[PDB]
Structures are given as C-alpha cells and as structure tokens.
Write a protein that binds this ligand. Structure first.
Ligand SMILES: *[C@@H]1O[C@H](CO)[C@@H](O[C@@H]2O[C@H](CO)[C@@H](O)[C@H](O)[C@H]2NC(C)=O)[C@H](O)[C@H]1NC(C)=O
Lengths: 37, 49
C-alpha cells in the first residue's frame, strides 16, 4: 500500500543525510590535506 | 564526530494532546503484520538521533 512507502522513505531520509555527510566530510579532509592516513 | 545523545521521536500512532508526554519505546508497526519486537520489512524503532 502507498502509505507504507511514505513511512519507508522517512526512515531513509534520516539515515542517509547523516551517512552521506560523514562520507563527504572525510572526502574533504583528503582533498585539502593529503596523507595516506 | 557527532553528538548522538539527542534523540527525537519520529513515529507515533496519534498526535499528542497538548502538554502530553510519551517516553515509551515499544516498536512501531508498518503494514498489517505481527513483528513481535524486531525490525524488518515495514517496522522499526521509533527514535532517531
Ligand atoms: C592532515 O590532517 C591530519 C588529521 O586531520 C593531521 O594529522 C594529525 O591530526 C591530529 C589531530 O587529530 C594531530 O593531533 C596530529 O598532530 C596530526 N599529525 C601530525 C603528524 O601532525 C595532519 O597533521 C594534517 N596534515 C598536515 C600537513 O598538517
């Protein structure tokens, strides 16, 4: 049913925004200061 | 690193009455189905951080 999909995406829209953040914040620290660590 | 100690409730059966308070944690309930305490298809914890 359609209302089950809305509750699916809200769970997605909260877990994704944080996991995309850190995964892009760590790509900033590599791009502006290169080590291998 | 993220302060993950500040949570909020994001699923409830019905909107609160004014000045009402709800600290329970009983799992939610998606489409018609049991789900005896356990995440999975259409069902999951009610608190995010
Ligand atoms: C590049 O960034 C890293 C981490 O952001 C720096 O490495 C260490 O960072 C910690 C902070 O958590 C410091 O306490 C250490 O002293 C840093 N290591 C060293 C060897 O200084 C790293 O310094 C940065 N690159 C440069 C050239 O400063």
């Amino acid at each position: 049913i359609e209302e089950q999909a809305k509750t699916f995406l809200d769970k997605f829209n909260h877990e994704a925004e944080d996991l995309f953040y850190q995964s892009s914040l760590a790509s900033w620290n590599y791009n502006t200061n290169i080590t291998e660590e | 690193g993220g302060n993950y100690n500040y949570l909020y409730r994001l699923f409830r059966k019905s909107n609160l009455k004014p000045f009402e308070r709800d600290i329970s944690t009983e799992i939610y309930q998606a489409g018609s189905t049991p789900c005896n305490g356990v995440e999975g298809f259409n069902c999951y914890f009610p608190l995010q951080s």
